Amino acid sequence: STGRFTLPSEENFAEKTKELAELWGADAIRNSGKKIYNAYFPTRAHNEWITLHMDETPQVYLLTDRILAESDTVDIPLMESFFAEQLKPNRDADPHKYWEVVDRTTGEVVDSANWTLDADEDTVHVSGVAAWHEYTVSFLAYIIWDPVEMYNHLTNDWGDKEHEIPFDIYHPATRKFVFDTFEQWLKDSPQTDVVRFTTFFYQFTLLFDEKRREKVVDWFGCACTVSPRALDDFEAKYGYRLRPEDFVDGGAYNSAWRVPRKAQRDWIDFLSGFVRENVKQLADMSHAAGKEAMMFLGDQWIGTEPYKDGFDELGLDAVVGSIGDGTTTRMIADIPGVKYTEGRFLPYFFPDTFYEGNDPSIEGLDNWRKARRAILRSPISRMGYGGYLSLAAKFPKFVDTVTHIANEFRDIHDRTGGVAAEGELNVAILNSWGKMRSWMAFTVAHALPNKQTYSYYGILESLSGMRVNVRFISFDDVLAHGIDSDIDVIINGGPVDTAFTGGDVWTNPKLVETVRAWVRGGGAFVGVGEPSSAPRFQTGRFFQLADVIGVDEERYQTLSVDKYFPPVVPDHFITADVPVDPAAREAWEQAGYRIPLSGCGGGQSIKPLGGIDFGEPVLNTYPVNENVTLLRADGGQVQLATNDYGKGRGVYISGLPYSAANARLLERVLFYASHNEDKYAAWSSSNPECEVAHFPEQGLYCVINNTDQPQKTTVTLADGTTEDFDLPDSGIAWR
Amino acid sequence: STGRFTLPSEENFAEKTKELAELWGADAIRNSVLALGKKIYNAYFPTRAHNEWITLHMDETPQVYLLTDRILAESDTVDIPLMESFFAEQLKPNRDADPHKYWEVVDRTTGEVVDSANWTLDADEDTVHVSGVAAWHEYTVSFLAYIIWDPVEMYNHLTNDWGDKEHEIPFDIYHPATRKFVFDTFEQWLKDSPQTDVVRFTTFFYQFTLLFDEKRREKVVDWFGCACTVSPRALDDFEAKYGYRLRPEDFVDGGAYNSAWRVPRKAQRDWIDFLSGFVRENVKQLADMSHAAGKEAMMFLGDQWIGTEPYKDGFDELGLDAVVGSIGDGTTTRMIADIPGVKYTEGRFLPYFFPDTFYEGNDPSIEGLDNWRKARRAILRSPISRMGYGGYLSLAAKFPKFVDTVTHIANEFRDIHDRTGGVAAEGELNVAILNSWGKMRSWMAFTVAHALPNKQTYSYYGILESLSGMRVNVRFISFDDVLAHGIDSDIDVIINGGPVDTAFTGGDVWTNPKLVETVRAWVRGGGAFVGVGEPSSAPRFQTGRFFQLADVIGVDEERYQTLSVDKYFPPVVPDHFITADVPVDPAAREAWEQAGYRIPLSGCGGGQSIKPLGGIDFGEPVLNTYPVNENVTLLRADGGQVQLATNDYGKGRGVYISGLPYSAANARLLERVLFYASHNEDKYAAWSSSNPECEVAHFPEQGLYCVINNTDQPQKTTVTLADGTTEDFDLPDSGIAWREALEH
Ligand SMILES: CC(=O)N[C@@H]1[C@@H](O)[C@@H](O)[C@@H](CO)O[C@@H]1O
Ligand SMILES: CC(=O)N[C@@H]1[C@@H](O)[C@@H](O)[C@@H](CO)O[C@@H]1O
Ligand SMILES: [Mg+2]
Ligand SMILES: [Mg+2]
Ligand SMILES: [Mg+2]
């Protein structure tokens, strides 16, 4: 137990650095005979360069607000809705060539002969248009303040501190400056052992409004990656010209939730080739200087595509990433083609958690736990923290917390040999993106699930630390090669008309044939939210695989058809670990079920059984026939159901916020749907708040407490014997 | 006080009949005595009650297109059971009419019709064998079925557990033989019925969609539905006349069966036009024969009423003397009351005199008065001529509290009529409900089964129930009306309500720029647009705009296309004209004030209240509504979405309401929305009740107003008159008070 830990550094704290490095077994130190990390920012920190070449800043297509015409002319302000300190209209590149004015009421592009850019203000004058339509402008804008340095400035209130102007290496002058500068920096940095690229060339979509608030964000977004030259080169390489609409996307800005369009994939391929070649050059230069190249998974990471084939050819030594939860841990941990991986764990060493009176040991251990369950399934090589080491030195409780965490992290390695725990089922998440977005489904802002996303993000968070093997596949994979014979369960989840359910791909009969035949043969299909949904295709069928999962969503087209709900089965394998208050169940049992009534169907429980948090409701789901097993169908609709389908099974879940109870529910769903109930017992914890990781090649299993509470649990082993555990706060026991 | 009241009666009950007729001031008696001199009603059932005829001509029963279950093929052949999902006592596949000409097998997975060469109907079994199909697709048959049990007679049989009695077989006058039988039989009946004064046709020729399943439960219902109206000959004649052949699909409609909630298709309107021409011709003949015999013809608004179209032009040319209908609530009262083209209208009130309500230990007087209150508030806005009850008088006679309640109700019904002269109260605003159907479905939007709103519909039906007794003039207009002629210059407020992709919101009509132009210009000019649920919604048309008029009402629905755009909610304004009568809960309000609003957070927007204010029942949620900009006024935006908002739009205003179950409080909320959105706040006070549990009806031409208590509790209220003076009332349980007003 020595190493695998990264210490942050600071001002005149050499004494205490030596002491905390030795107590924590740190083998590396990061900058604000150890391994020395220095962050590198290829597209900023050189205002002396970019102010003399201001047409080489990165650029972005922006969509104005919708302006109502009240006659045959309308004026459209360009900048009223954007942060003028970050963004500026590009007046250099011919607006009639590079911009588009759109009648949003008809979807038609307004002829360029019908609009002008005012000479003295940032306003477009549209003429010859229709009264009472809404108009917008899609315009090129220079990004004049690095989005992340800007976010840090605002967040920390840096006041009048000079704003860092970002620059785009797509232009040869800037590219040469960047590489010459890095060449010299390498020479000037003989003490640096690891170049921590934070990050590379293109920032994820991060645009601010006129009130200095975030306006548009997408951790995967490609908005901030255009220029007149790139657009013209793209047309030459791909053989058609992109519209501004191909970037602003009606105001959606190509959110990862949108069903991906050819133009998006083409643009990703275009940037990717460019970014990767230049990242490889940086890595090679780093290597020729005797240093390792480490990439931060975030910020300017667009075009790297860590999960696409070829990432290995970059020769990056490492990826480091932000550890917020199990899902975000897996995003880092599962990346192929680097030598090692690193988590930057919480809390960051900065006053918002390190104030007098606070116990930062608690955050520190929660973060360890959320990530630990995922680390057992997919180990990360190294751990470390960032920020002010002197701030964290004040809190002796937390210093102790770290000694414990670093020791445990290292003991896992020493015991495990960096081997993943054994997975008990092979589960595949099917969506439009597949492997290229492994652990990335449902994210908008990194680590920040919200009202609209948490009912689906919980599926990944549950899976992140679960005792099963998770893979990510696309509709393209399935249509080209069928379903791999080693897969036990397919999960399709999300709202209608997204990348995550799949949109009109579900009207492709080859897809439906493939999934139906595989389930009939013994496969297992789990649909969450609006799985397999296709609007309008069939008047009487919204979820195209409703026959598989036993459930459809009423869309107000079939109200004339009475819906008959079979009685709910409250005692079932899937819900076996759900506690239900006896008085709640009694009330449910006593109130009974609706009697058939004209135009209202029948059989819906008059009171809810309850007991399970399913998150956001999917309104008016109903069972397709009375042979479907309803497990929860409260409030006149369906939350949880299972259906036999030849030799296989379908399961419907309306939504699934992460909690230990809901992860147990999903785990049971996975064993049940795959007809593997008999396989569930081996290497399981009786208590849902604990989890078991089995390591057979090492003849070993561990059990973890995912809470800060004492946990009592009984572990059932393969041979059928049981073991009682009484685990302390965040405990771990090995047998 | 006597008259305008129809009493039911029965055999061996002349004395109780005479007494109650006198007590209730009844002027009519309903068969189910003759010496009393009352107007005698007799029910007539044109299309049933003659098994002796139809058993001899069974191919003249009415028919329906039925859709089977979806059957999964697991190879290139598949067998489809025709009858496994239907009630075999009610429905029989039609084997007489060439199935290859009249039926369709459909691959539901692709939408494709299977070549009729690839399928055969089993000679011995009600099963279709299909070959040359794709494995792993679902297949269905759409087939013609004879209806061998009258749906309503069957409903009554099952409901009343008649077990044994013979099933009445219905018949279809589209066939000349049956048509002659029906007319000759009526000619005969009239001769045999010299005592009858009013023929109560219950009803005419075509039963509303009412189909049962193999478990003897309702399977499919639509009070407006045309399912039970087809025949080989009618389908073939339609093709000749309209120049195109209807597919079985134009009826089964993918399993929707042409629900009134579906955006109407041309094929539906053509079929209604076709049926209605034939039904109306024959109803006119029945009415003419009645009139020639010295009798009146009265039509029940219900059961076999398909093709009559009481709200379509030409209804008056039938010469029907009356329409009678079931009083279920205010909305169903207005369905009857607003019918033009008859001499008088009648309500049959609740409870029905039957053992399900008249049983020992039950108090049917409470239901009787509740039913009267719900209808009375609507009757003030649109009078009906008569009331009455149905069923077994001998049952009602055993409940003296009930009998006395009826005496009170009859006297009050007549007093209202005498005081107002049968004239509607003054309406204080002109409100138009806009949907795909318009006038022909007046008071009929949101209905599936008559008077039975459910989880899926009540959030919208409550709009009509609120309006049904409200002090405003309500009309129903269609998108065709607006596109053809603009918005009538007298309209103050347009309401558009319902879920996306329905007749009630309108579907893709909202992608027609002429409609959007017309409504926007009108609101900008001082109009008022109230959108409920998913108003003006059109899916997929614009990635960043779902409600096409989101700019007018200030609210849109997030459809998971725009999650990258941070949503910023302005602070909620809890004190506002619209919400002025919502009861204040200080535990809720202080909890909401203290908890404050979300701070901006990446990918999560900001400004949403962390705790809900509450206080208003908006029914079914519309998930993820948000304000389009921070100049919209949020009135309720609890739980990270929007329930209630107003937006200024030039001279006019838009208002968004996520849903509106009926209650006194919500009817007041809607009423205040109408006055506010139309910039008519200072018109609000004249002829109003401070207390929302009461309502006011002003009759300028009679120099009167009244105030009514819509509850069974005492209610104190202050009425405000036009001259700004007020009067205080202490109204008893279900009461009414009349006062003088300046005569005009
Ligand atoms: C992993 C990653 O990209 N982290 C970034 C962080 O560096 C900062 O840019 C922030 C702005 O809201 O967005 C993310 O959290
Ligand atoms: C008004 C009207 O048509 N009433 C009918 C009633 O007569 C009966 O047919 C019932 C069957 O569910 O459906 C409706 O309530
Ligand atoms: Mg704005
Ligand atoms: Mg070209
Ligand atoms: Mg007027």
Is the distance from CB of A144 to CB of A165 less than 8 angstroms? yes
Give A497's contacts in chain B (Cβ within 8 Å).
539-540, 559-561
Q: How would you label A570-592 residue by residue, b for 16+ Cβ within 10 Å and e otherwise?
A: bebebbeebeeeeeeeeebeeee
Query: What's the number of CA atoms in the CB half-sphere (13 Å) around residue B630?
Result: 14
> How far is Cα of residue A329 from the mean position of the Cα atoms in its chain?
11
**With a 6 A CB cut-off, is B450 part of the ligand 2 pocket?**
yes
State how far the Cα of A69 lies from the Cα of A79, in Å rounded to an integer. Answer: 18
Q: Give how far B111 is from chain A: nearest CA, Å.
A: 8
Candidates A559, A621, A624, partner chain B, best to mutate (most B CBs within 10 A): A559
- d(CA A130, CA A233) in angstroms, rounded, equals 36
Q: Are residues A365 and A326 in the same domain?
A: yes
- Shortest distance between the Cα of A530 and any Cα of chain B, in A, equals 12
B142, B196: one domain: no
Question: Ligand 2 pocket, B527 CB below 6 A?
Answer: no
Residue A151 near ligand 1, beta carbon < 6 Å: yes
A299 C-alpha to ligand 1 centroid (Å): 6
Ligand 1 contact, A298 CB (< 6 A): yes
Cis, peptide link before residue A379, omega less than 30° from 0: no
CA A107 to chain centre: 31
Which of B167, B186, B204 is the C-terminal boundary of a domain? B167
Asked whether the beta carbons of A454 and A615 are under 8 A apart, the reply is yes
Residue B199 tokens read as: 């023929």
Torsions phi, psi of B83, nearest 5? -110, 0
Closest CA to A560 of A507, A599, A530: A599
B192 plus B302 within the same structural domain: yes
Distance, CA of A422 to CA of A504 (rounded, Å): 37
Residues A620 and A653 in one domain: yes
Neighboring chain A residues of B261 at a CB cutoff of 8 Å: 556-557, 559
Q: How far apart are CA B670 and CA B656, in angstroms?
A: 11
Query: Which value, to the nearest 10 degrees, does the dihedral of the CA atoms of residues A384, A385, A389, A395 take?
Result: -100
| C-alpha separations of B58 from A588, B164, B235 in Å | 49, 22, 18
Beta bridge partners of B699: B704
- Active-site residues of B, by number, are 303
Q: After which residues is chain B broken (C to N over 2.5 A)?
A: 32
Out of B108, B543, B544, name the one closest to residue A541 (CB).
B108
Counting every residue, how long is chain A? Answer: 735
Can you tell me the distance from the alpha carbon of B624 to that of B609, in angstroms, rounded to the nearest whole number? 14
Three-state DSSP class for residue A165: coil
Give nearest CA residue, ligand 1 atom 2. Answer: A298
- CATH number assigned to the domain comprising residue A489: 3.40.50.880
**What is the DSSP track for B290-339?**
HHHTT-EEEEESSSSBTTT-TTSTTGGGG---EEEEE--SHHHHHHHHT-
Instruction: Copy the structure tokens of residue A27.
Output: 């083998």
Residue of A nearest to B600 (CA): A213
Tokens 């005081």, located at residue: B419
List the catalytic residue out of A146, A218, A249, A299: A299
CA–centroid distance, B430 to ligand 5, in Å, is 7
Domains of chain A: total: 4
Of A703, A138, A111, whose CA–CA distance to A373 is shortest?
A703
Distances (CA, A) of A333 to A202, A297, A301, A317, A422: 23, 11, 16, 14, 16
Measured in angstroms, the CA of A730 and the nearest CA of chain B are apart by 29
The domain in which residue B743 lies consists of: 686-744
List b or e across A52-73, with b for residues whose CB sees 16 or more CB atoms inside 10 angstroms: eeebbbbbbbbbbbbbbbeeee
Residues A42 and A106 in one domain: no
3-state DSSP percent of chain A in helix, strand and coil, to 5: 30, 25, 45
Residue B278: give its domain's CATH number.
3.20.20.80
Encode burial over A686-709: b for 16+ CB neighbours within 10 A, e otherwise. ebbbbbbbbbeeeeebbbbbbbee
Tokens 């605003």, located at residue: B429
Residue B428: how many other CB atoms lie within 10 Å:
22
Tokens of B492: 């103050």
The token pair that represents B631 in the structure block: 């100049």
Nearest atom, ligand 2, residue B152 CA? 9
Q: What share of chain B is helix, strand, coil (3-state, %, to 5)?
A: 30, 25, 45
**A162 CA to middle of ligand 1, Å?**
21
Closest chain A residue to the Cα of B67, Cα to Cα: A540
Rounded (10°) CA dihedral B182, B183, B185, B189: 130
B226 and B272 in a single domain? The answer is yes
Closest CB from B111, B136, B564 relative to A252: B564
Distance from the alpha carbon of residue B351 to the mean position of ligand 1, in angstroms: 66
Residues of A in contact with B629 (CB under 8 A): 65
Nearest CA to ligand 2 atom 1: B302
Q: Kindly state the tokens that stand for B742.
A: 């300046």
Query: CA A16, CA A20: separation in Å to the nearest integer?
Result: 6
Indicate the SS3 state at residue B587: helix
* Among the bound ligands, the one closest to the CA of A79: 3
State whether A579 and A635 are in the same domain: yes
CB B655 within 8 A of CB B676: yes
Ligand index nearest the alpha carbon of residue A154: 1
Considering only CB atoms, which chain A residues are within 8 Å of B256? 539-540, 557-558, 560-561
User: Number of helices and strands (H, E) in chain A?
Assistant: 19, 36
Q: Is B155 in the pocket of ligand 2 (CB under 6 A)?
A: yes
Q: Chain B: nearest CA to A618, how far in angstroms?
A: 9
Q: Nearest bound ligand to CA B429? A: 5
Cis peptide before B351 (omega within 30 of 0): yes
A653 neighbors A614 (Cβ within 8 angstroms): yes
Chain A residue with Cα closest to B521: A132
Q: Which atom of ligand 1 is nearest to the CA of A147?
A: 9
Taking the CA atoms of B33, B37, B38 and B44 in sequence, report the sign of the dihedral they define: positive
Q: Are residues A413 and A471 in the same domain?
A: no
Q: Enter the tokens of residue B589.
A: 């309000």
The answer to whether the CB of B304 falls within 8 A of the CB of B43 is: no
Distance of CA A129 from the midpoint of ligand 4 (Å): 29
Residue B373 in tokens:
């209150």
Atom 12, ligand 1: residue with shortest CA distance: B602
Residue partners of B740: CB distance under 8 A and separation at least 6: B703, B704
Q: Distance, in angstroms, between B262 CA and closest chain A CA?
A: 6
What's the gap in Å between A82 CA and the centre of ligand 3? 8
Chain B hits for A616, CB-CB cut-off 8 Å, are: 623
Cα of B566 to ligand 3 centre, how many Å?
10
Q: Residue type at A556? A: Y
Query: Cα distance from B228 to chain A (closest Cα, Å)?
Result: 14
CA distance A82 to A552: 42
Closest CA to A525 of A478, A489, A474: A489
Query: Is the beta carbon of A148 within 6 A of some atom in ligand 1?
Result: yes
A622 shares a domain with A493? yes
- Chain A residues near residue B356 by CB distance under 8 angstroms: none
Q: Which residue has the tokens 């492994």?
A: A438
- Domain end among A656, A681, A706: A681
Q: Among the three residues A163, A198, A215, which one is the final residue of a domain in this structure? A: A163
A446 lines ligand 1 (CB under 6 A): yes
How many A/B residue pairs have CB atoms within 8 Å?
223
B220·A560 Cβ contact <8 A? yes
Give the CB-side neighbour count of residue A137, counting CA atoms within 13 A.
Answer: 26
B558 and B700 housed in the same domain: no
Q: Resolution of the experimental model in angstroms, please? A: 1.9
Task: Please report residues of A whose CB lies closer than 8 A to that of B545.
Answer: 66, 104, 250-251
- Count helices and strands in chain B by DSSP H and E runs: 19, 35
Nearest by CB to residue B256, choosing from A251, A540, A564, is A540
| Rg over CA atoms, chain B | 28
Same domain, A47 and A91: no
Unique residue bearing structure tokens 């004649």? B237
Specify the 3-state DSSP secondary structure of A592.
coil
Q: Which atom of ligand 1 is nearest to the CA of A447?
A: 15
Among candidate residues B487, B478, B546, the one with its CA nearest the CA of residue B519: B487
Please check whether residues A481 and A571 belong to one and the same domain: yes
Residues of B whose CB is below 8 A from A251: 543-545, 562, 565
CATH code for the domain of A730: 2.60.40.1180
In sequence order, the β-bridge partners of residue B128 are B80, B121
Residue among B150, B154, B198 at smallest CA distance from B172 = B150
Tell me the Cα Rg of chain A. Answer: 28
- Given a contact cutoff of 8 angstroms between Cβ atoms, the answer to whether B323 and B335 are in contact is no
**Two tokens at B158?**
């099952």
For residue A39 and ligand 1, the question of a CB distance below 6 A is answered with no
* A146 within ligand 1 shell (Cβ under 6 A): no
Q: For residue B135, what is the nearest residue in chain A, using CA coordinates?
A: A513
Mutation target for A interface from B564, B598, B647, B648: give the one with most A CBs within 10 A.
B564
Q: Do B452 and A598 touch (CB under 8 A)?
A: yes
Helix axes A361-377, A396-416, angle to 10 degrees: 10
**Selection from B672, B595, B578 nearest residue B638 by Cα:** B595
SS3 B388: strand
**B152: closest CA among B45, B8, B275?**
B45
Q: What is the DSSP letter of B60?
A: G
Ramachandran area for residue A337 (φ above 0: left; ψ -120 to 50: alpha; else beta) = left
| The pair of three-digit structure tokens given for residue B15, joined into one six-digit string | 């004395």
User: Is residue B119 classed as helix, strand or coil in its secondary structure?
Assistant: strand
Measured CA distances, A293 to A28, A194, A273, A285, A338 (Å): 14, 6, 19, 9, 10
State the residue for tokens 């020595």.
A2
